[PDB]
Design a protein around this ligand. Structure first.
Ligand SMILES: NC(=O)c1ccc[n+]([C@@H]2O[C@H](COP(=O)([O-])OP(=O)(O)OC[C@H]3O[C@@H](n4c(Br)nc5c(N)ncnc54)[C@H](OP(=O)(O)O)[C@@H]3O)[C@@H](O)[C@H]2O)c1
Ligand SMILES: NC(=O)c1ccc[n+]([C@@H]2O[C@H](COP(=O)([O-])OP(=O)(O)OC[C@H]3O[C@@H](n4c(Br)nc5c(N)ncnc54)[C@H](OP(=O)(O)O)[C@@H]3O)[C@@H](O)[C@H]2O)c1
Lengths: 473, 473
């Protein structure tokens, strides 16, 4: 018994995590099912370290100090069950299996329970940051069977990213599939930030007639304001990047965005639990829209746009307007984000700490920014805050962006620039603001052709059906 | 053996369908699990008819002429399986069970298959029209095991609604859960038309400062143009309706729209199969938004809108603009609609006839309009049409609405009127029109932090990963 923990999965991610643990002075024993890679790694990337290698699961198992704790960094689905299947014969009661892959939260729920009756503590951690992050400090969102926590605590917390105060971007998220649900919402939001930036980019390019150099200038200027964040930083870099031949690389890239399912799942869960997360949803369908590249080429030949009117206005004011519109829409996407988190917390009975979650996304992870700090502030002042838009900072932030956000959308709209996420954020803001909505008309017509029954404004609760057919006749 | 068919389920729907069949001269034997209702119906609504009553399933079963065909009009889920369970012992090979309830298409797929190995022909029909329709002529969308079709054909076709040419709004849709998938897309679209009308209503009300009388005037004027349809007709009636006390009824109704899940499922399936059906999706989230009525009241007190600028323009021109914007967005929602249908057809291997489907929605059903006729035209001229927007009628229709649709959205946007479906339809139109989209930026950043790899515009197919980190350093 010498290894404090094991990690199974030696793709770069696993590999880097093992090293990161090693630097914090934890003896890890690695394992992988194509076992040659254990040697390959010990010889190459890991030479000089304290990491032990294992050639059999039972070897890995005997290596472990108790409580045994092993991590799975294997891609999702079937694979994780199969590893689990094998590990159970070999484990004692009180032992711990961790699933770091991007697993479906219902599978984590299943596995966690099933194992608890077998006496094994199971946790599902979301891991974020990518390779870079896995090596120096990822954010780790662990949920599942709470008993496990104190045993992995010092490890998880020690290898995580920490923001300035020294806080690790990792703490116990909650029961069952909490860690893995939070993780998919993170990615859902990640989709959202990217699409907004594309929209911001599309207005500069097509309306303002800007070039990639000034565009990167603009983005790095913006990264000095409230938009200070990782995806704004990297977009500045991406826009300046000269290919081998001198030309800019970006306009050479094919416009068919991929997705490995997480953002999609976020949108499914919102539709299932009745939460209006419109911007992540628009983002997911935007990526599907970009996949019909051949259709679009065919379409551009047949479908006309607006009459061409130039932009007779000021390039730098409008550039300011685009910044505001972006910032405002970012806030909406996050409020919709934490709404879903709240609903989930109530449908599965998890006690989520939203301020904690925000801190766990302030470092390591791809959506990291200063902005998450300002969200954290909100939930410390009020853990019970019902919607983020109600917090004074954010209500002040959006009314301050009012005129610009509506100006930008409107100009975009005349020019023919597709803005799916800028528009849903404004529609949602205007929708949520109104204490009375035309949904009454919906209720009336449902009752007309389908007799579904309706409530009155006053006397909420008693249902009526009107014979509308004729008021007589 | 005297009954040509049986119907199990004596809610008004079942009841009316039985009568409708009876008028076409088919002896039906009714059954229901609270058996007293069979008497209740025979004595009351059905007295004087040819309908027989049954007190035991085995009684119902012996009543039947062969091939035995019985219809289930029971609400979905568990219930339908249980009826099925019981009917199998009692049925012979070649017998037919029909499911008219709004069942999940995956359940229809399961049941259809399972039964085929038991030798029973199973069909899932979507039924639309509501009570009214079930009595004189519903639209019936039947899918499942094709063998069944010729045996029920004359019945189904005979009791269906028929449009002017004499065509029944019913024909064989296709295999497995085709009929029930089509049905849920119908409802998805139904949601879409309603939300658009609410949006149209919200601009007249809040911007144009119109009153319910002129608003109904406007809607019935519009029902004389391309918008001639059932939901426009009934909205005219709904707006004029005076309550007991003289006042208009509509503004007394609580604005929290319900949904019995179908529209939602449509949006799930689109997210699952990667189809950008943005307007039905916006519609579903709009209904969820209206359920947070208490939140909205709380929100209106804290969240500011745009600076109040009146509408200094012309009320009747703008009213024309709203009509156009509605019509245009209707077209987009339907194109997105038939896209999903096409994708489904390809993922399950159904040979859907889209012109047929359109005819099946031109009568009986809630979304019926003249508009469906013009869609039918498109798929007759070209069964292979890839997207409805490419058809000459519709491309001409939308460019004709260009200026008004963008004018209306823009004014809405300044005024603070929530338009989620008007905006996604314009964003989608502008998105689909562009042969090149900023999705390239998405692809570039995914490759940056996650190494996902990208394609080049030219040389579509070979994947590259750039070390962006520093172009040196
Ligand atoms: N760039 C990165 O490194 C990166 C970025 C973002 C996220 N991730 C995270 O790391 C996780 C896994 O790494 P990846 O993204 O490269 O995904 P992969 O799909 O490449 O997963 C690689 C691992 O899965 C193991 N595995 C497979 Br594949 N099938 C297995 C099976 N049937 N039984 C047992 N083990 C099996 C492989 O073992 P083998 O190699 O012996 O086949 C390998 O260790 C992801 O789910 C995600 O959480 C990684
Ligand atoms: N206004 C309308 O009539 C209308 C409008 C729109 C759609 N629909 C359509 O008609 C269908 C059913 O009518 P509905 O909308 O009133 O829905 P309901 O949920 O009221 O379904 C009523 C039927 O379900 C039967 N049933 C139930 Br409930 N539980 C059952 C069980 N456990 N085992 C066997 N049978 C069971 C009832 O028998 P019991 O009465 O003996 O309990 C009754 O015949 C819907 O799914 C839909 O397709 C009707």
């Amino acid at each position: 018994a010498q290894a404090d923990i094991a990690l199974i999965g030696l793709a770069v991610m696993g590999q880097n995590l093992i090293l990161n643990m090693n630097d914090h002075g934890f003896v890890v024993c690695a394992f992988n099912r194509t076992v040659s890679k254990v040697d390959d790694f010990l010889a190459n990337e890991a030479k000089g370290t304290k990491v032990l290698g294992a050639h059999s699961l039972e070897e890995m198992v005997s290596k472990l100090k108790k409580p045994r704790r092993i991590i799975l960094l294997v891609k999702a689905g079937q694979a994780v069950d199969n590893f689990i299947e094998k590990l159970v014969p070999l484990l004692d009661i009180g032992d711990i299996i961790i699933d770091g892959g991007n697993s479906e939260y219902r599978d984590t729920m299943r596995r966690c329970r099933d194992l608890k009756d077998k006496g094994i503590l199971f946790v599902g951690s979301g891991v974020s940051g990518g390779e870079d992050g896995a090596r120096y400090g990822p954010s780790l969102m662990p949920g599942g069977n709470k008993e496990a926590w104190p045993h992995i605590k010092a490890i998880f917390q020690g290898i995580a990213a920490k923001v300035g105060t020294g806080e690790p971007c990792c703490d116990w998220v909650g029961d069952d599939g909490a860690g893995h649900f939070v993780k998919m919402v993170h990615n859902g939001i990640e989709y959202g930030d990217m699409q907004l930036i594309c929209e911001a980019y599309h207005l500069m390019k097509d309306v303002l007639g800007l070039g990639h150099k000034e565009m990167a200038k603009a983005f790095e200027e913006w990264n000095k304001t409230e938009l200070d964040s990782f995806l704004i930083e990297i977009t500045a870099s991406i826009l300046k990047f000269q290919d081998a031949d001198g030309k800019h690389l970006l306009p050479k890239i094919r416009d068919s965005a991929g997705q490995k399912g997480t953002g999609k799942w976020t949108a499914i869960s919102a539709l299932e639990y009745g939460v209006p997360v419109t911007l992540i949803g628009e983002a997911v369908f935007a990526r599907c829209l970009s996949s019909l590249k051949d259709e679009r080429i065919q379409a551009s030949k047949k479908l006309k746009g607006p009459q061409n009117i130039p932009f007779e206005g000021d390039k730098k004011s409008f550039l300011e307007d685009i910044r505001k519109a972006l910032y405002a829409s970012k806030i909406i996407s996050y409020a919709q984000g934490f709404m879903l988190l709240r609903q989930a917390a109530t449908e599965f009975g998890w006690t989520l700490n939203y301020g904690g979650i925000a801190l766990m996304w302030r470092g390591g992870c791809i959506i990291r920014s200063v902005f998450l700090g300002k969200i954290k502030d909100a939930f410390d002042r009020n853990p019970g805050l019902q919607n983020l838009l109600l917090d004074d900072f954010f209500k002040s932030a959006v009314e301050n962006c009012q005129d610009s956000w509506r100006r930008a959308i409107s100009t975009g709209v005349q020019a023919g620039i597709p803005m799916p996420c800028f528009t849903t954020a404004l529609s949602f803001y205007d929708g949520y603001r109104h204490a009375m909505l035309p949904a009454n008309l919906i209720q009336a017509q449902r009752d007309y052709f389908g007799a579904h029954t309706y409530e009155l404004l006053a006397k909420p609760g008693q249902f009526i059906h009107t014979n509308w057919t004729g008021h007589g006749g």
